[PDB]
C-alpha cells in the first residue's frame, strides 16, 4: 500500500486568534463569546486528529516528527522585515500584522512549526520516505501574501514548502489544487508570473477575499496560463464540484504534467460550515481525494501531498477529513458519517443542478474549451 | 408602541450534550465548548444587544404568562402533552425527530408558548401596535402529535387558536421566513381556509429533501398554503423579489385581519444550519414590507415570533435591525459584517438564475 | 424597597485569552471553554437566577448612570484615567498587576463604577432603603494609580467621594467580605478617620502573602483600618464569630452614617480562587448582621457592592440569598448544594482552632 | 525514575457526564452552562497529556496500545448484574446508576477502556516491560463500590487491576496510596476485610463522601490494621502533606512490605481546584512522587504504578501532573509552573502550620 505520512504537532493546537465572536473582534457592538473564542478554533482542527485516533486510522499511518521551518526556509518567500516584525510582535504578546490574521504570544514559533509540517510532507514525498502525505497545518497558509498575512494565515506554508523543495530536490513542475472554499490569493500572488508552479483555486464566488471571482486572472508574463481560478456559485455542492474537477481541474493537471501535486485542503466547503455557503459532505472529499490520487499516479508517480488549510465546523470537519484520510491511505475504518444521508437530501435539485452545469460549462468555454 | 415578550427561563431550555445538532456517542466526540445548536446564547445575544443599544428601553416588556393546558390542547392531543410533562419531570428526552429537552423543559416550553399567545392577544386588543415574541424553544416544525426540529410546542398555531377563542378573529396569515420549511404550521392548518400559511425556505433543507411548491392545501384549505422554496446560496435580492412577486401579493389577495411572521434568523450569511446569504439590512427591509402590508391590510396588527437562528455572532445584528424597523426606532448600532456580507452577494449570473427561479414559481401558481 | 443597579454592558467586559487567570503563551494552553476567571457568566448568572425566581420583579432597577471622569478623578490621577482610555481604544491591555481588559473596557469600567456611585446616592437621598450594585469589573484591589486583581477603578472609594461631595456624609464604614484583602480601599483611606475600612480575607491569598492585622491606619487614620485575616479552610461558624466578635463591635464603636459592604462571593465552598467554606446561607446571615447594624447605627442605610466570585454554578445561590435578606423577600429558590456544603464544614478540632485564631485577633486589638 | 509506560487512549476523553453546571444537574433552579458542561470535563484530563506532548516529555515515555478490561476482569470486583445494567443503560443513551456517577451513550465502552489502562499498567510493571507506569484513567475509579458507582467513578479501576494481577501473577501484597483529595471509599470497601491489600487514603476531612473522616476505620476481620485513613483539615497545604507522608504513609508502607505500590493520584488537592479546599502545588506532587519512588525502590524493586483519578482545575492540573511525570520518568523538561511562586506565598503561615502539625501528631498517636 501507499504508506501515508501524517504530519502533526500538538503545539499547532495552541495557536489562539484571541477574543473574537467567530471572526469578529470584541469591542463596540460585538459581545464577547461565553464559549470557545474565535472561528479558527483549536478544536476545529484537533477533532479531525481525535477521530483518526478513535477509528484506529492513525495507527495505519506513519507520523514523523517534523522540524520547524527555519528563517532561511521562510525567507525564500517572505521578506526578512516581515519575519522580524512577526517575531517581535509575537514575543511582545501577539497582534495582527495583516488583514484578519490575529495571533497570541508565541504565535511566531507555532507558525514556524506549522510551516515545518508542510515542508516535511513535501520533502519526504519527494525523497520517497512515504508515498503520500497529509500535513495538519495550523495556522493555515493559502491567504498569506509575501509581506502581508491575511485570513488566518501567518506564513505561506505551501509556497515555502515548494521553494524548499526546489532548493533540495530541483523539482521542475508543481501543481497546487486549492479546494479550500476560499480563494488561494496567497498562492496565486506568489507564483503569478511563474510557469513552474501551476496554481489552481476552486472557491465560492466572491467569499474571501470578499467580492473576488478571478476566472480571467490567468497569470502574467512567463506565468501567463499557469494560474487557474474556478469560482463556483454559493450553494453549489457535490455534483458541481465533481463536474468542475472532471472538466477543469483534472484536464489542467493533465496539460501541465507536474512532478508533484499538492492539495491545499480546506474543509470549509462542508455543508454546515459557518464561513461559506457550499454543500459538500464526507463522500465528496473521499471522491475528490481519489481523483487527486489517480491524477498523481498517472502523472507523477503517486507523489501527492495534502496540506490542511481552513475548516470551521467542529462537528462535521472531522468526518470530511477522515474520509479524505481514508482515501489517501487506501484504508477503510468502521467510521460512519451520521450526517451523510441528510447531506445527500440537502443537495441541489434538478433546476439548480442545470444552473451549476451551465456555470461550469461557461468557465470551460471561457478558457478555450 | 412595540411590545417585546421575553422571559429569562426560555434561555434555560437545554437540548443536551450534542456537537452542533449531532447527538453524542458513537463517532461524535462531545463538544469542549457550548453544547448543541439551539444554544441559549444564539437567542440571548439578540436581547443583550437590544439592551446594549438602549433599544429595549423604548419597547414595552410585559411579564410572561405561560400557555395553559387548555391553550395547548386546542392544537395538541392531551396524550402528547401528558407524555411531554412526564418525560420532562423524569429528566428529559426526545419525543420526536431532533426535539431533545432537559428536566423541566415542559414548563419552559409552556412559558415560551405563552409569549406568542400574549404577543398576539395584546396586539389584537390594541395594548400595543405590533409585537415581537422571543420564543425559545421554537415552534414552526412541531406537528399536532409530533415535536420536530427543536420545536416542542406549536407556538404560532396555539396563539392563533387562542386568538380565535378570545377575539373571534377570522383571517390570519403566517409568513414564515425562518430558513427551514414551516411544516408544523402547514400541517396543522392544511385543510383550513381561515389561516393562510406561507413558507419561504431553502429548498430541500429541513425537513430534508422537501420543496413543496405543489402542496397548496387540501379541502377548504386548497389555495391557503403557499411554499416558496429558494435555492441554497440565494441572498438579499432573491428574498426581496420573492416578497415582491409572491409573498406580498398573496397577502393582498387574502386580506388578513392579523399578520404573524415566523421569524427565524437562520437565513443569515454565516449560519451553520443553512446556506443562505441574508444580512441585517435584508431583515430590516423584509420587516418593513410586513409593516407596510399590515398597515395596508389590517390596521398595522403585526406580530413577529422568533423561531430559528444559530450563528451566535451574527443573529444579534439581524434581529436588532428587524426590531428597529418594527419599533420605528433607530439606534447607533453598526453591523460590523454588513460590508462583507454585501460583497458576498450573488453576482450577475447567479442573480439571473434566482430571478428565473422565482419567475417560474410565480408562473406555476397559475 | 431595595434598589438593584446593573447594566447589560458590564457583562461585555472581557479579560482576554487566559486559562483561568493564566495568560496564554509559553506553557499555558488556550482554554477550549470560556476564557478567563472573571467571566461574564460568573456575574450574570446571579442576575439570571433573580429573574428566574421572580425576585428581580420585587426590586427597583434604576437605569445605569456611568461614572464621569470628574467622579473617578476624586480618587485617581487624571493621567491614569487618560492612559486607561487610550489603551482601551487601542484594543486593551493591562496597566497594573493582574488587571487585563479588552477593547472598550474603559467605557465598561466607567459604567460599572457608576453603578456603585448611584446605589450609594439613592440610599443617602432616601429613594430606596438599601441597595445592591452588580459591579463588573470589580473595584476593591484598585490603587489610586495602579489597577490590580481584576479591578480597574476604585468603585467604592469613588462612590464614597461622590457621596461626600453631593451629600457631605461624615462617617462611612466599608465591610469587605470578598475573600481577598481589600488593599485598594485600605490604601486609599489609610490616613483618614472618616472612612473605616474593614477587610475579612483568607490569610495570604491576594495580595499573595499578605495578612495585615497589624496594619491599623496611620496618622489621623490610626485605628480606622481593620484587617481580619482568616486561615484557609475556615467556613460558616468561623465567619460568624469574626463578625460577632470583631466586625460588628467595630461598627458599633465607629458610628457610621452609612454602611457599604464590598461583597465578593468568592469565599463560597467551590470557588477556584480561594480555599474557604461559606455557603449560600452564610451570605444571608452575614447580610442580616449588616442589616441589623445599619438599622441600629445609620437609619438602615446599607449598600452592597459586588466584587469577586468565580464559581459560576454556585455564586448565584450565594448572591440570591443575600438579595433575599437585603430585600426581605421570599422566593421558592432552594440551594441544591446546601446540605453537602453543611456536611463539608470543619469538624470540632478545626473549629476550636478557628475560634482560637479569632480570639487572638480580638486580644491583639487590645 | 525509569523507562516509564504511559497508558492513555483518545476515547477516554470522549466520556461526557452530561449537561451539568459544575457537578450540579441542570434543571429546577440550576441554569445550564454556556461554556464546558460538567466538572469531570474531558479537558481537565486531556490538558495534562497535551502539555506532556508540548514539552517533549511524551517522547521519552513508552505508550502501549490500550487493552480494554474484559467483562471477566471487571467481574472479579463487580457483580455481573451491575455490569449488565450498566451496559444496557449505556446502549439506551446513558444515565446514572449510582450517586453522582452520570454518563452518556457509550459510556460503558469507555469505562471498560479506562479500566483496561490501569489493568495493563499494573500487568506491565509486574511482568517487567517497564519499571513504573502512569495510567491516564478517565472515568476514575476510587469512589466506585462493588455494586454502586459514585463520584464520577463507574468501575473500580484499581481494585480490578489488582485482582487481575492476582489472577495472572499470584502477587501477594499490594499497597494503594490514594492521594486524590477525596476519600477512596471504593477501594477501602472492596478490600476492607483483606490483609493482602493495604489501602491508604489521605483526604480532605468531610469532603467526599460528605461528612466522612474515617481515621478509626482500620479494617475488619483479617483486614484489621490494613486500612489507614488520614483525614486532613480543609486548607492544609504542602507542609501538611509532607508531614502526613513522612509520619504516617511511608511508615505504613515500610511495615506492610508491599510487592507493588499503586498510587491513586487525583490532582484535585491543587491550590485552585473547585472540588476541594487544599493548597498543594506542582512541586508538592513532584516530591510526593519522589517519596513513593523511593519507597518502591526500597520495598519492591521499584515497582510503582500511578493511576489518574480526580482533578478539576483545567488550568493548573497540567502543571501538577507534569511535575509528577517528570519524577516518575526521571526526565527533565523546560516546563516552568507559572503559578508556583504565588502558590508558595499562599501556603499556611506559622499558626495554621502548628495546627496542621498537631492534627497529624494526634493522628499518629491514635495509631496504636
Ligand atoms: C472573512 C471570513 C472568511 C474566512 C477567512 C479565512 C478563509 C480560509 O479558511 O481560507
Ligand atoms: C439541520 C437539521 C435541523 C434543522 C432544524 C430547523 C429548526 C429551525 O427552523 O430553526
Ligand atoms: C491571581 C489570584 C486571584 C485573586 C484575584 C481576584 C481578586 C478578587 O476577586 O477580589
Ligand atoms: C460533589 C463534590 C465532589 C465530587 C466527588 C468526586 C471526587 C473525586 O474526584 O474523587
Ligand atoms: K503560476
Ligand atoms: K480554494
Ligand atoms: K407554527
Ligand atoms: K420558512
Ligand atoms: K391553510
Ligand atoms: K475599594
Ligand atoms: K476582604
Ligand atoms: K481609614
Ligand atoms: K484520598
Ligand atoms: K485492606
Ligand atoms: Zn478557507
Ligand atoms: Zn430554521
Ligand atoms: Zn475576591
Ligand atoms: Zn477526587
Numbering used by the authors:
A (entry chain C): 1 to 369
B (entry chain B), C (entry chain A): 3 to 368
D (entry chain D): 1 to 368
Quote what the paper states about this structure.
All active site residues were conserved, as shown by the multiple sequence alignment and the structural alignment, suggesting a general acid/base catalytic mechanism for the bacterial enzymes as described for the eukaryotic counterparts. These enzymes mediate catalysis using a penta-coordinated catalytic Zn2+ ion coordinated by two aspartates and a histidine (KpHdaH (1b): Asp181, Asp269, His183).
For RwDmhA (1b) we identified an all-trans octanoic acid in the substrate binding tunnel coordinating the active site Zn2+ ion with its carboxylate moiety. We did neither supply the acetate nor the octanoic acid in the crystallization condition, which might therefore originate from protein production and the activity of the enzymes in E. coli. For RwDmhA (1b) and RsPrpH (1b) we discovered a hydrophobic 22-LFL-24/32-LYF-34 motif in the L1-loop lining the substrate binding tunnel, the sequence 98-GHLAP-102/107-GMLAP-111 as well as the sequence 342-MAEAW-346/352-MFALW−356 in the C-terminal α-helix lining the active site rim. Only for RwDmhA (1b) and RsPrpH (1b), which evolved toward non-protein substrates, the second proline is substituted for an Ala suggesting this position being important for substrate specificity to accommodate the product. For RwDmhA (1b), we discovered it being an active lysine deacylase, which might suggest that this 1b enzyme is capable to act as lysine deacylase additionally to the reported dimethoate hydrolase activity. For RwDmhA (1b), we identified an all-trans-octanoic acid in the crystal structure, suggesting RwDmhA (1b) being capable of releasing this fatty acid upon deacylation from their substrate.
